[PDB]
RNA sequence: GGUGAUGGCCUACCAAGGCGACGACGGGUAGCCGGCCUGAGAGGGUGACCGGCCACACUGGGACUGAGAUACGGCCCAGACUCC
RNA sequence: UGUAAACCUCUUUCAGCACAGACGAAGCGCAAGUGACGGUAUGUGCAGAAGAAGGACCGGCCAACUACGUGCCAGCAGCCGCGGUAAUACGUAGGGUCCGAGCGUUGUCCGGAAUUACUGGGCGUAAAGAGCUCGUAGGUGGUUUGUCGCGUUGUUCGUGAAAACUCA
RNA sequence: ACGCAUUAAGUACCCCGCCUGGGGAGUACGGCCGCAAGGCUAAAACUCAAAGGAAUUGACGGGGGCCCGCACAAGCGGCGGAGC
């Protein structure tokens, strides 16, 4: 490419695909869930993972995974959602952060408590 | 946040005399624990880590404050490793340790912590003060009746005084004349790997 | 057509070094003459001469090859091509290979090597890096 | 007392009608720590065996380097089959900046302060071969002055000559403290 | 060069063209 | 004619001219800069604090006084909105 | 576990109790007054470890490992991927590494990314040479004499607010 | 790497076209041309963690060349037919 071409046309950059659209410049968002249920991932990973179908306040419906093994979560629950990529599931992008406004911390989890929202043993 | 753990611990881990009178180190140089006999993986990273680990645990400072001193060191016009080491040796407490008034590096840290010195007409409870050339370090007034320090000043036959120190005081008055330089220091691991890590 | 005479010159030198030829003949020019003079001074070529042809004059260059057929010149490449005219303030007289290589600046005083150009302080257009 | 390396261990396998007859390789780079540099590429079923093949190979196939106290003279571009490297001299107090391969090379050679950068074909094999091409391409000022008939004065700068006599006096006094 | 690439190309082109045959009519008589 | 002043800034009149591929005319976004972050370096992102300019004062216009007015805690009018 | 423990001792920072107590003011005023900060900062004396440490990770990338419970499960995961009772990759045990009054996760931006390649890339088969020519605007241009100093290049004044960055 | 190697895929400059992971798609919408067929310019959501180029070993081939085994051909007696 001659410099004349560079001058006359330009160097059109890429754009990196901005992930995590629903949060909209937010680290977290607030959610009121529609359905809370379970669904199975792809053929190798034979299991049954726990998911909700949330209506955030960006006015976008999203499937979002629930870490840990316990939930007080059913319809209408008022929760808080954060970002994180799960390999297993097709288009799942968002996780619920436990210990915020409905999600009770899993019990007897005492290693790795900061992430799962667990108070320290006395 | 000063360190608190056993001096024996890091000693058994990495394998260096830093305390001096560590018979548990002599007895068990291998690392401690359940896999204290177990074997470790080699690399560039492990070595470059172990370097600064030994240094900053010898002298008490933390990783981030060491990095601050590093930023100054490579901000200098000299060369990073050895001028870092000169900076790092310019500390007050390490100077008095090499003068030998104190038994442990912890002990020099504690002495300067508790305000037991009196420098040019100001109390200095600063365990990291930087001492340039021609700094008249007198000691305070109540320094006399510290009993283990009485024994210290009286029979201070431990590790010798280096070249760049001296005492010209009946009151144990220690003075700087020149600054430390690495050809005469002769201390454990040199800081080239440290430079390469912090400028990774 | 042709457009780039200096690059033709340098490429042909590179080619004759590549072939281990001993001499080259080119069409003649005043700029090329200054170039061969400078290269003789710096010690790459042995000696040139200006001969003639049917209608135009001609330069004849005699290269330099080490005793065991060690070429005297590693490589070479032009810098200031037509299109991008590559000028220099004297603050940034580009060195080559720790300074071991040679530049060829054209300046008020004529065609100045990098060192003398720096000593004189002035500078201007570049033609080539050499080593 | 020759330093030896391991910067490549791959598990290759020919295939026979029966199955996979596995195999191992090794790329060893030897150097005394003083400028003497050599490269073997051994291979066998046993990793000791392959590495020892490469060891004797590199013991044969040494190669001399333009070193200075701890840095080379000048920069160079080493292009290989597929790998590219940009060796550039540092100032004393820098470190042996490279990845794994070229770092091992230059630590075998003992260059304590120099730069490089991998620009393509990250595989250590061709990384090393481009590195070695660059090192063969390094040319000494003594040689340059010799070939083009001009002195080291006309042919080389002042800071290098400073460092030359500096490291020379350091090496003389080093020997005088060592043996004498 | 392999041929899987050109096969997939061919497939796309055929299938779109067949669709345009089956909608030859409505596109004409809708795009007014 | 008009202003502190040049000026289609306005007025009646004469010619029909002007701009544009170097992007007019349009749309989308957005306050600008000294700077801040990163980077070997170029360059990219970006405009917290502080400092300097621009614009705004519920919405949309206008004028007054006056050395000097987007006249935020002045006026007038029309809306919208709350109270008596 | 681990020199850790008590327990023989020492100094007691930093907190706490009580008295002393500020520059900021060559100021202002022609009045006896003039400190919100502020009775603090700073001191000086008394008692004594008495009032004080947690967080993430451990297969490699990336320094640090074993046992126990479930065993295609529940579950973890930044990537490879881990799990069908004997898991150093799941939850917990002890243990160890890292950091430290912070520790991890999240969100964006830069770098890495020579991954828009002016510095610094490519087009036979990996993505890439218009189906081939003529040609407008434009870009580029042989040899030599003379000339202008527009570019370019050299110095000096003017300028680049201050704050910034870096050296002392 | 295959391979090009004076008819260069190397050596250097001039000009131009063109590319920036695969798929979606050279598709949709809008437009220009076209009697029609349809051509040109030309995306996005969304999704995969690869798609791909060259060469090696093995196997395979209703590709080939050379060969052996009651493998077939020839000659015999059986199974499958009934009883146990």
Largest interface chains and counts:
C-D, 12 and 17 residues
Report the total helices of chain B.
10
Q: Could you give a short account of the major beta sheet of chain B? A: 3 strands, antiparallel
Distance between the termini of chain B: 27 Å
Helix content of chain E: over 70%
Biggest sheet overview of chain E: none
Task: Please outline the helices and strands.
The structure is cut from a larger assembly and holds chains A (122 residues), B (200 residues), C (131 residues), D (180 residues) and E (32 residues).
Chain A: H1 3-8, E1 29-39, E2 49-56, E3 61-65, E4 78-83, E5 94-96
Parallel strand pairs in A: 3-5
Antiparallel strand pairs in A: 1-2, 1-4, 2-3, 4-5
Chain D: E1 13-15, E2 20-22, E3 24-31, E4 37-44, H1 47-60, E5 62-63, E6 76-79, E7 84-89, H2 101-108, E8 114-115, E9 118-120, H3 124-137, H4 141-148, H5 152-155, H6 158-178
Antiparallel strand pairs in D: 1-2, 3-4, 4-5, 6-7, 7-8, 7-9
Chain E: H1 4-22, H2 24-28
The structure holds 3 RNA strands.
InterPro entries (chain A): NA-bd_OB-fold (IPR012340), Ribosomal_uS12 (IPR006032), Ribosomal_uS12_bac (IPR005679)
GO biological process, one term (chain A): translation
Protein name (chain A): Small ribosomal subunit protein uS12
Task: Give structural notes.
This is part of a larger assembly, with chains A (122 residues), B (200 residues), C (131 residues), D (180 residues) and E (32 residues). Chain B is mostly helical and 200 residues long. In chain B, 44% of the residues lie in helices and 4% in strands. In chain B, α3 (44-59) crosses α10 (192-198), α4 (63-75) packs across α5 and α6 (92-99) packs across α7 (105-113). Chain C has helices at residues 5-19, 30-42, 114-120, and strands spanning 23-27, 47-52, 57-62, 76-78, 102-107, 110-113, 125-130. The longest helix of chain C has 15 residues, at 5-19. Chain C is globular and about 40 Å long. Chain D has six helices and nine strands, in the order ββββαβββαββαααα. Chain D has helices at residues 47-60, 101-108, 124-137, 141-148, 152-155, 158-178, and strands spanning 13-15, 20-22, 24-31, 37-44, 62-63, 76-79, 84-89, 114-115, 118-120. Chain D has 180 residues and is α+β, with helices and mostly antiparallel strands. At the C-D interface, loops of C face α4 of D. Chain A binds three RNA strands through residues 1-8, 10-14, 18, 20, 23, 25-28, 44-49, 67-69, 82-88, 90-91, 95, 97, 106, 108-115, 120.
């Amino acid at each position: 490419p001659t410099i004349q071409q560079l001058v006359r046309k330009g160097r059109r950059d890429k754009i990196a695909k901005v992930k995590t659209a629903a949060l909209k410049g937010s680290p977290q968002r607030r959610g009121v869930c529609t359905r809370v249920y379970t669904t199975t991932p792809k053929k190798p990973n034979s299991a049954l993972r726990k998911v909700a179908r949330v209506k955030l306040t960006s006015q976008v419906e999203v499937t979002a995974y629930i870490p840990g093994e316990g939930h007080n979560l059913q319809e209408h629950s008022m929760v808080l959602v954060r970002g994180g990529r799960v390999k297993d599931l097709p288009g799942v992008r968002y996780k619920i952060i436990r210990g915020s406004l409905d999600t009770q911390g899993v019990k007897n989890r005492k290693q790795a408590r900061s992430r799962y929202g667990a108070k320290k043993e006395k | 946040a000063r360190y608190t753990g056993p001096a024996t611990r890091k000693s058994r881990r990495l394998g260096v005399d830093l305390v001096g009178g560590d018979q548990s180190f002599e007895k068990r140089p291998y690392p401690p624990g359940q896999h204290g006999r177990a074997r470790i993986k080699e690399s560039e990273y492990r070595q470059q880590l172990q370097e600064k680990q030994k240094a900053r645990f010898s002298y008490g400072v933390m990783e981030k404050q060491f990095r601050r001193y590093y930023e100054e060191a490579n901000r200098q016009p000299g060369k990073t490793g050895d001028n870092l080491l000169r900076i790092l040796e310019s500390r007050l407490d390490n100077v008095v340790y090499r003068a030998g008034l104190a038994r442990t590096r912890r002990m020099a840290r504690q002495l300067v912590s508790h305000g037991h010195f009196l420098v040019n007409g100001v109390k200095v409870d600063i365990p990291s003060y930087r001492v340039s050339q021609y700094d008249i370090i007198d000691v305070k007034e109540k320094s006399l009746n510290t009993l283990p320090f009485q024994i210290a000043r009286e029979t201070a036959g431990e590790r010798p005084i280096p070249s760049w120190l001296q005492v010209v005081g009946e009151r144990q008055r220690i003075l700087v004349h020149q600054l430390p330089e690495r050809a005469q220091i002769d201390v454990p691991l040199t800081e080239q790997l440290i430079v390469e890590l912090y400028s990774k | 057509t042709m457009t780039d005479p200096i690059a033709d010159f340098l490429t042909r030198l590179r080619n004759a070094n590549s072939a281990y030829h001993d001499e080259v003949t080119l069409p003649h020019s005043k700029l090329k003459a200054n170039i061969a003079e400078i290269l003789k001074r710096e010690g790459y070529i042995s000696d040139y001469r200006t001969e003639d042809a049917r209608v135009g004059k001609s330069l004849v260059v005699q290269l330099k090859y080490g005793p065991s057929r060690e070429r005297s010149i590693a490589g070479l490449r032009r810098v200031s091509k037509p299109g991008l005219r590559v000028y220099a303030k004297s603050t940034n007289l580009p060195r080559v290979l720790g300074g071991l290589g040679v530049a060829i600046i054209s300046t008020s005083s004529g065609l100045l090597t990098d060192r003398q150009a720096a000593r004189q302080g002035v500078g201007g257009e570049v033609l080539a890096y050499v080593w | 007392n020759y330093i030896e390396r391991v910067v490549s261990i791959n598990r290759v396998s020919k295939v026979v009608k029966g199955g996979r007859r596995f195999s191992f390789t090794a790329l060893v780079i030897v150097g005394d720590g003083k400028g003497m540099v050599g490269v073997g590429y051994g291979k066998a079923k046993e990793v000791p065996a392959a590495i020892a093949k490469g060891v004797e190979e590199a013991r044969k196939n040494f190669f001399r380097v333009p070193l200075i106290g701890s840095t080379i003279t000048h920069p160079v571009q080493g292009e290989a089959a597929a790998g590219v490297v940009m060796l550039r001299p540092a100032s004393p107090g820098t470190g042996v900046i490279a990845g794994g391969a070229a770092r091992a090379v230059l630590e075998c050679a003992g260059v304590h302060d120099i730069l490089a950068k991998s620009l393509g074909s990250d595989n250590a094999i061709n990384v090393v071969h481009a590195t070695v091409a660059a090192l063969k391409l390094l040319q000494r000022p003594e040689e340059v002055a010799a070939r083009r008939g001009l002195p080291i004065e006309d042919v080389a700068p002042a800071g290098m000559l400073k460092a030359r006599r500096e490291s020379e006096a350091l090496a003389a006094a080093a020997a005088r403290e060592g043996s004498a | 060069g392999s041929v899987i690439k050109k096969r997939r190309k061919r497939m796309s082109k055929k299938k779109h063209r067949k669709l345009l045959r089956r909608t030859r009519v409505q596109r004409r008589k809708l795009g007014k």
